[PDB]
C-alpha cells in the first residue's frame, strides 16, 4: 500500500499559510529517495535525518503540512528562526525531524489581475508554538481601546494578503511548501520506506 | 528619546512635488501609526491621511487621493508622504504625528507629533 | 463625512477663569475617537485629551475633556498665562474620513 503523497504534493489549491493543512500519514510506504532526486522541488532539506536514510526507517506516524508562501519566507521554514511566518502563521520545533520542501507555484497562484486569496497573519498577540495554528479573524487591538468589531486607530485586522503577481521576482512569487515530519513513540512503527 | 524628526523646509515650484520624511526614535514604531497633517499660517488644521506601520495599509482624505502618496521604510523607522502636481494652495507647515508605543501596548492617541516641514509652493 | 465645529471662534478671559471650549459633530461618533489638541502660535499641536476624557501623559489637572455623541467640550477649570493659545478637536474614529474643527482661541480679555 503506497502512501498517498500525491494528494498533498499535487493538490490543485494550497491552503493559506495561516491555516496550514495537516494531513495525517497511517500505514503505506513510499520512496523518499525518488521525492528528494527529483528535479520538481527547488527545496529539500532535512533535519534531524538523513534524507537518503529515510528508506530504511520506519516511524509510528507521518504528517504533510502544505501551505503557500512568498519566495523570501521559505527560509523561514527551519528550526529556530524568526519573522511573520516563524512567528505568526507556521512554527517548526527546534528539536524537528523531518524535511521541508518547496517548489516555484507561479503559473498556479498568479492572476493576470493579482491572486489576493493567499493571506498570512501580520498581527498576534503572541508568537506561536511549534505546530500551532491560528486562523482566528479578530480585530487585533494595538491599543487599550476595545474595537468592537471596527478597523481603525489602533485596531487593524489581524491577517494580510499576498500580492500574488506574474510580474514579480522569485522572492516575490508565490512557493507551495510540504513540510514532512517523521514520529516515533512507543506505539509500533507505521509509515515506512521500501527498505524495511 | 520619543520624538519623530522631519527633513527641513522644501521650496518647490508649481506641477513638481514634494516628499517630507518623519524619522521616529525612541519608541516601537514597528507597532504604530503615523497620520499627516498639514496648516497654512494662520489657518486650521487639515488632515491629509495616515498610514499603519505594520503593514503599510494607507486612507487619504479624498481631497488628496489623486497625488499624494504616503509610505513607511521599516530598516529606518521613517515615514514618508510625499505631494504630487503642487499648488499655492499647498504651502503650509506638514506635521506628522503618531501615538506611543511599548512592546505590549501603544498609546489611544496622537501624542507624539513631529517639528513640522515648511513647504513653499511659488514660481 | 464627519464634520467638527468648534465655539465659540474667540474665548475672550481672564487667568483664573474658567474656561468651556465646545466641539459639536453633524453626526454621533466614538468618545474613544475624540481629542483635543492645543497649539501655541508656534509651535507644532500638543496632545490635551484623548478618548474625549482622558489626559495625555503631563497634562495638567485643570485640563478636563467630557461629553458623548455629537457634544464635546474641553474644560480649563482655571486660567494659566501659558493657556491663552488655539485649541483643536480631532475626531479619528473607523479607518477613513478624520477631521478636524476649525479652532478655537483663547484671548486675554481687557
Known amino acids: 500500500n503506497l502512501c498517498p503523497f500525491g494528494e498533498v504534493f499535487n493538490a490543485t489549491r494550497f491552503a493559506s499559510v495561516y491555516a496550514w493543512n495537516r494531513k495525517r500519514i497511517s500505514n503505506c510506504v513510499a520512496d523518499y529517495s525518488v521525492l528528494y532526486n527529483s528535479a520538481s522541488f527547488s527545496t529539500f532539506k532535512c533535519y534531524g535525518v538523513s534524507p537518503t536514510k529515510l528508506n530504511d526507517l520506519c516511524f509510528t506516524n507521518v504528517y504533510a503540512d502544505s501551505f503557500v508562501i512568498r519566495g523570501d519566507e521559505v527560509r523561514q521554514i527551519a528550526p529556530g528562526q524568526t519573522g511573520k511566518i516563524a512567528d505568526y502563521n507556521y512554527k517548526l520545533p527546534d528539536d524537528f525531524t523531518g524535511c521541508v520542501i518547496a517548489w516555484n507555484s507561479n503559473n498556479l497562484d498568479s492572476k493576470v489581475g493579482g491572486n489576493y486569496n493567499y493571506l498570512y497573519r501580520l498581527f498576534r498577540k503572541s508568537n506561536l508554538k511549534p505546530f500551532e495554528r491560528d486562523i482566528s479573524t479578530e480585530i487585533y487591538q494595538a491599543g487599550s481601546t476595545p474595537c468592537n468589531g471596527v478597523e481603525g486607530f489602533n485596531c487593524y485586522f489581524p491577517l494580510q494578503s499576498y500580492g500574488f503577481q506574474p510580474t514579480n521576482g522569485v522572492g516575490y512569487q508565490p512557493y507551495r511548501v510540504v513540510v514532512l515530519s517523521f514520529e516515533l513513540l512507543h506505539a509500533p512503527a507505521t509509515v515506512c520506506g521500501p527498505k524495511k | 528619546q520619543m520624538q519623530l524628526v522631519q527633513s527641513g523646509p522644501e521650496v518647490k515650484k508649481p506641477g513638481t512635488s514634494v516628499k517630507v520624511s518623519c524619522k521616529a526614535s525612541?519608541?516601537?514604531?514597528?507597532?504604530?501609526?503615523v497620520q499627516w497633517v498639514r496648516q497654512a499660517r494662520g489657518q486650521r488644521l487639515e488632515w491629509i491621511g495616515w498610514?499603519?506601520?505594520?503593514?503599510?495599509?494607507?486612507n487619504y482624505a479624498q481631497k488628496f487621493q489623486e497625488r499624494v502618496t504616503i509610505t513607511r521604510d521599516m530598516s529606518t523607522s521613517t515615514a514618508y508622504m510625499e505631494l504630487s502636481s503642487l499648488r499655492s494652495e499647498d504651502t503650509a507647515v506638514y506635521y506628522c504625528?503618531?501615538?506611543?508605543?511599548?512592546?505590549?501596548?501603544?498609546?489611544?492617541?496622537?501624542?507624539?507629533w513631529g517639528q513640522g516641514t515648511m513647504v513653499t509652493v511659488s514660481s | 463625512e464627519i464634520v467638527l465645529t468648534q465655539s465659540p471662534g474667540t474665548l475672550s478671559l481672564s487667568p483664573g477663569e474658567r474656561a468651556t471650549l465646545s466641539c459639536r459633530a453633524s453626526?454621533?461618533?466614538?468618545?474613544?475617537?475624540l481629542a483635543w489638541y492645543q497649539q501655541k502660535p508656534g509651535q507644532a499641536p500638543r496632545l490635551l485629551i484623548y478618548?474625549?476624557?482622558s489626559r495625555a501623559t503631563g497634562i495638567p489637572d485643570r485640563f478636563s475633556g467630557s461629553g458623548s455623541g455629537t457634544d464635546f467640550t474641553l474644560t480649563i477649570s482655571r486660567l494659566e498665562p501659558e493657556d491663552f493659545a488655539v485649541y483643536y478637536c480631532?475626531?479619528?474614529?473607523?479607518?477613513?474620513?478624520?477631521?478636524f474643527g476649525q479652532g478655537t482661541k483663547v484671548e486675554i480679555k481687557r
Open positions: 504625528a503618531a501615538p506611543y508605543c511599548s512592546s505590549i501596548s501603544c498609546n489611544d492617541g496622537f501624542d507624539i
Open positions: 525612541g519608541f516601537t514604531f514597528m507597532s504604530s501609526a
Open positions: 498610514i499603519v506601520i505594520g503593514s503599510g495599509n494607507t
Open positions: 453626526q454621533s461618533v466614538s468618545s474613544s475617537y
Open positions: 478618548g474625549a476624557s
Open positions: 480631532q475626531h479619528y474614529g473607523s479607518s477613513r474620513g478624520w477631521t
